[PDB]
Design a protein around this ligand. Structure first.
Ligand SMILES: [Mg+2]
Ligand SMILES: [Mg+2]
Ligand SMILES: [Mg+2]
Ligand SMILES: [Mg+2]
Lengths: 289, 292, 292, 289
């Protein structure tokens, strides 16, 4: 093939996808923005030369990020998203019949507008009257308003400006005070591969373990991310549902059928491998400020 | 970083690993053979420009290929490997104290000799008195003798590649050649290609369904292998049940296997054998059957 | 720089250009067609993944292909192009005030239509009343009519590619089809592939020698084209002499050609037609002749 | 093909060669050193990830760099090389029957030793009793000795530490005073492509034009350099021989047959194209210090 997009996944490892075209470009003062039409992954959002989202598999990431947290809550009505600029996190949240308010808080207005314009999958989500888009830093937004939430979703970049939103101090003193009683936090937690998980996933898991009584790490392969990806659920109430109860709740509470996630899938995703489980156990690093 | 090993996973997707050196080569009329020293994955065995084995993570593939089958068997004593020329399958098998004999049947004597010399991780395994190496087509080998086995392991190229391996994935091969050479309680396991959300339809689903036509109990399972750049799959098949708990698997590992596994415990296997919604449904609905 | 156009010059040598965009595409059953906006070379026309023309330097190829032949002719009035679908050959021809008619005979109407629309450098040329476009095989076209030409230009793919073009480089084609359709003093010129110190042996030397079997005077010449990543070659052939000085060439350019050439003056042509020791000797000793 | 060496020729242009192996490695305090076995170009010397010399075509570069200068001199006996660490410049000079002394002056002793060990083509040259290897900066070496030379050869990197060895002041006040009467200077002068020639070739030519009465620029394709390369001859005596006289001198003065260069080849190489000739004419930049 003639035309390629190339990305360095790590210093010694590069990934190249064949290209059909370069569909749209933009920029903010913050970042370069591109929407590529790629052969293996369809339309691909790239920010500062890093793939953010691919048409063929973003559903995996967003179903995994959103549905477990909401399904384990008895009745989640409002949710705050730290980041989520592309609109797909909000899309998945708005499928829940209990939800009456979604706040999406991201720093880069031009990315949000670019995705509102050009990510067709999220056109309905961006028009939903339950959605509010806030242009701010998530710490400042959470500190400056008294509203508390049933669910808070971390959908930022890996821990730079975002690092402070994974610290023990942030979690303990800023984030929990904005969770309602019985509330649930979930964050994306970076690569979760047999070796790649030590970069940040293990640290995020251990940091949350210091702050919340119940913490459930889980993971799933995302082809366009070139790795297993991770997430962590955290709450001061138990996070324990069977596959069967999860499936019943999905049928009762979520409009239409999920494409990736059913109850057994969640159970599998939350059963980490021997080496990963032990490594999370042994982890001593805690993010601080 | 100026030197790179490059591989086309798909015609539209390329993976590149930084290279420390190109250590050794061979070739037979079957395939070219290279051993590379790579930065991300350590020493890597490449056959016809496809990475076969990387030092950092080959343990995942070989533990997943070998241990579930032997642990589900009540007392596995003899094993036949179709392929496995690198030696790593035999190495994992030979960790089982129950085992009395492993036969490794590979078509390419040059691959075996290269790996016996160059893959030092497998030197013990290759010199174990329990190991017999046979250079033959596995179908011909199995048909030619009446010896039966407790476990038969498929460690061959994917059937998509369509050369001499393809016949070793067909319904008739399994029914008329392989099953007659399994003992009472015998278990077959084969590697079964990519098992990704989309990639699983190329061969994993087809291998599953073909086995479903021959054996009563068929358990597909999968695990990520970083150096393969995908989820990989395997399928257990048997006429006796394959339904052990995580804890019972752990008990058997502790009793039967020399040293601790690096990748696989019982819970890992249960997780591996719980496929995602879409993959489960895709396997359930598969109608392709491999035939000659 | 994340987006790249990549081309295998040789199976062992790859060239990569940073990409601004992928502007347009077509396809016929002959070949895929793409127009790319590249950083190093500007807009580039790619046919079946081989760069054909780049905006920054296509003037070199087309001035070298066209001007030497017409300038050596005493009064060239009509010209036949074999191939030339991009329009650039016709454009350079039409700069000559002596010219009354150019016939452009290309097999792939889709390439012509794509370029007429998308290569704006050639829009004038394509709308010139002196230009006739014919969609045909050039052998069939030439044999089918008795019209003769002052200059015939070969602007086809290399004969190595071995498809419908190959016959247009054979001894018998040149002797029995082309030479009968040249007027008194007629000059043939063809592009003749890579002309590098080593690359010249693939086709340049063979084209030279094949022409040497048919015409009395044969003048091979070459020039670097950055976007081709090599020295490129052309060969003049005629039954009348081809021996003008640099100054006489410059005089003719000033008299006959509208606007100043960007690449080619008389001294440049003399330099181009003085090949290096090894290339000269290699052409001198070539025995391969193209035949059907 | 599986294994590749990649080099960025310019910011928007990359070259990749298939590899057979990585044959030897070294380093100095100054640079990383590698000898690669490459498929298109044979054994290739790479310093700091930049290809220096390729087995298949280094003869072109070294024949072009050396033979014209010596052939235009009536009787060249001693020569000083600024750089030339690989030994190939000296190899070609030592083919001349008039030459009784070659000095090779390079800063990196470990590169010279690496090439003496591993560049088999130059084993004889490195053993020739006429060769002296000096480890020093060429300006300091030329300033600190009174010996004058018939020919001085610039075989350094493109104009960093080497930049000072292309200035008008260097040429006028350091280099000419070490040329004997009738002496000739030649330097490599970087890429000489239709557009690439403006980077340095045109500046080197113009700077020499300020200092010497007679200056002859010339160029030739080197496949492994990915471009036309350039050289400049300079003298205070005429540089004008016919192809025929050059060929006669080559037969009389050089042991064995040249592989690349004959008289007509030189004449061709010194006849630059219209655009390059005019651009050298128009060049105003002069390197100073
Ligand atoms: Mg993201
Ligand atoms: Mg593979
Ligand atoms: Mg080409
Ligand atoms: Mg050099």
């Amino acid at each position: 093939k003639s035309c390629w997009y190339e990305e360095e996944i790590e210093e010694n490892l590069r990934w190249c996808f064949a290209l059909n075209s370069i569909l749209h470009t933009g920029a903010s003062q913050y970042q370069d923005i591109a929407l590529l039409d790629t052969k293996p992954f369809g339309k691909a959002l790239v920010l500062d030369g890093k793939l953010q989202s691919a048409e063929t598999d973003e559903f995996i990431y967003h179903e995994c990020l959103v549905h477990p947290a909401l399904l384990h809550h008895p009745m989640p009505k409002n949710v705050f998203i730290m980041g989520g600029g592309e609109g797909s996190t909000a899309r998945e949240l708005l499928r829940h019949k209990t939800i009456d308010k979604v706040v999406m808080c991201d720093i880069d207005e031009e990315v949000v507008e670019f995705c509102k314009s050009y990510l067709v999958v999220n056109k309905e989500a961006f028009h939903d009257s339950r959605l509010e888009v806030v242009i701010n830093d998530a710490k400042a937004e959470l500190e400056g308003k008294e509203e508390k939430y049933d669910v808070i979703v971390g959908d930022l970049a890996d821990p730079g400006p975002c690092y402070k939103l994974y610290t023990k101090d942030f979690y303990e003193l800023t984030l929990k005070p904005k969770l309602k009683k019985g509330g649930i936090f979930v964050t994306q937690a970076g690569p979760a591969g047999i070796f790649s998980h030590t970069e940040v996933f293990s640290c995020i898991y251990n940091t949350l373990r210091q702050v919340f009584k119940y913490v459930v790490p889980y993971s799933a392969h995302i082809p366009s991310y070139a790795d297993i990806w991770g997430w962590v659920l955290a709450s001061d109430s138990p996070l324990d549902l069977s596959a069967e109860e999860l499936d019943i709740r999905m049928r009762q509470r979520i409009i239409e059928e999920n494409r990736y996630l059913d109850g057994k899938t969640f159970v599998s995703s939350s059963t980490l491998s021997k080496a990963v489980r032990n490594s999370l156990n042994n982890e001593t690093h805690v993010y601080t400020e």
